[PDB]
């Protein structure tokens, strides 16, 4: 019963920051590659941030190096995005998605959050 | 001996208490206004502004990998248990960020939502107590006896009800396991929630079982539209319809309860937070 929770999107201002949680459960957290997407209203679903290895600082999307990171928690199943220099143009649904090698490839989505940045 | 991000945690770590005062100061009333939902909001966001700053700085020590001395991480034990904090300094303080930054969205601010949905319930409702007065007049052939609109008064409660049976208690959006929605629904109260699927999730809803009792003793009394009542049946609806409404208050000052004491709660972790930040 794979799930992924999200939590902590919302208004923010131009500038501001965001941190955003997306707790896993339901499948082996370290077969997991966990990322970040975001989907603005009328463009196309893009990557944001990827990581694998805890230890790291993972990959990140251009549109967003240099103001996004990601992290990640083995022991509690999470991972964090850590929004800062926020625009206007980040405005979309953010949603993360864990691809589970496992025998098969899977790949689950949650239901996104929303960041709105604006005055 | 100062580091910009460390000068920065405290002080952001101090005004996130200064509004917690004000937000205590505000729970502290006897009545919530409108104007009380607007405040709170306020402070709320206040809170979280200053929240997603520290997690931003407690961020930077961690990616550079600031050290964290035995002593500052023998502070962090002083903890809240719902904070749920011999690993690196780059893990620890990584962790510190998730911590003040979940404890704000899935705890204190899951309070703050309840109190807002079941407030604007609350004062929906008594804006049907406002027109009360008027649903009530002398009847004709008694002196002691009233007439009551009836179907009015239940009209305005049936549109209260399909007002809010779209806005659930928690969670604010989207929806959740059931196993979720029950873990807040005994937090809150069985009796001020209730579990219900939204589409495949599940929500916990207002518990609008006073307005259904409002409604039953409403249909109880005879039929017609209007109702004629001698000063004795008057006396026993509006005893009943009463208590409904003080059952109704009493479930408000419960979640406000709730909602300030995790505000405490969150209040002790800052302060434990900023002590570790005074000896880093």
């Known amino acids: 019963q794979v799930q992924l929770a999200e939590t902590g999107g919302g208004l923010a201002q131009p500038g501001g920051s965001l941190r955003l949680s997306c707790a896993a459960s339901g499948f082996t957290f370290s077969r997991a590659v966990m990322n970040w997407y975001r989907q603005a209203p009328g463009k196309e679903r893009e990557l944001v941030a990827r990581?694998?290895?805890?230890?790291?600082?993972?990959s990140i999307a251009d549109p967003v190096k240099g103001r996004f990171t990601i992290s990640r928690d083995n022991a509690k199943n999470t991972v964090h995005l850590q929004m800062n220099s926020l625009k206007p143009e980040d405005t979309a649904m953010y949603v993360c998605?864990?691809?589970?090698?496992?025998?098969?490839?899977?790949?689950?989505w949650g239901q996104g959050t929303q960041v709105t940045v604006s005055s | 001996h100062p580091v910009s991000s460390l000068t920065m945690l405290n002080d952001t770590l101090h005004n996130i208490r200064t509004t917690n005062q004000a937000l205590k100061k505000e729970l502290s009333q006897k009545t919530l206004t409108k104007t009380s939902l607007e405040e709170i909001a306020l402070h709320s966001s206040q809170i979280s502004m200053d929240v997603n700053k520290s997690a931003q700085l407690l961020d930077i020590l961690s990616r550079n990998e600031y050290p964290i001395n035995k002593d500052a991480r023998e502070l962090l034990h002083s903890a809240p248990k719902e904070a749920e904090l011999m690993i690196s300094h780059r893990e620890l303080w990584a962790k510190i960020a998730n911590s003040i930054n979940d404890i704000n969205e899935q705890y204190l601010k899951v309070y703050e939502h309840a109190v807002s949905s079941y407030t604007q319930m609350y004062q929906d409702f008594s804006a049907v107590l406002s027109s009360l007065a008027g649903w009530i007049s002398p009847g004709g052939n008694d002196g002691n006896s009233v007439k009551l609109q009836v179907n009015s008064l239940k009209k305005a409660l049936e549109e209260l009800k399909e007002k809010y049976k779209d806005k659930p208690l928690y969670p604010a959006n989207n929806t959740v396991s059931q196993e979720q929605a029950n873990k807040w629904l005994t937090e809150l109260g069985g009796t001020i929630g209730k579990v219900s699927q939204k589409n495949g999730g599940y929500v916990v809803s207002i518990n609008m079982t006073p307005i259904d009792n409002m409604l039953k003793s409403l249909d109880n009394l005879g039929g017609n539209g209007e109702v004629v009542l001698d000063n004795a049946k008057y006396q026993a609806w509006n005893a009943g319809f009463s208590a409904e409404d003080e059952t109704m208050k009493n479930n408000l000052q419960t979640l406000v309860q709730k909602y300030s004491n995790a505000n405490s709660i969150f209040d002790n972790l800052v302060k434990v937070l900023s002590s570790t930040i005074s000896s880093s």
């Open positions: 990581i694998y290895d805890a230890g790291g600082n993972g």
């Open positions: 998605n864990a691809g589970i090698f496992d025998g098969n490839y899977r790949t689950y």
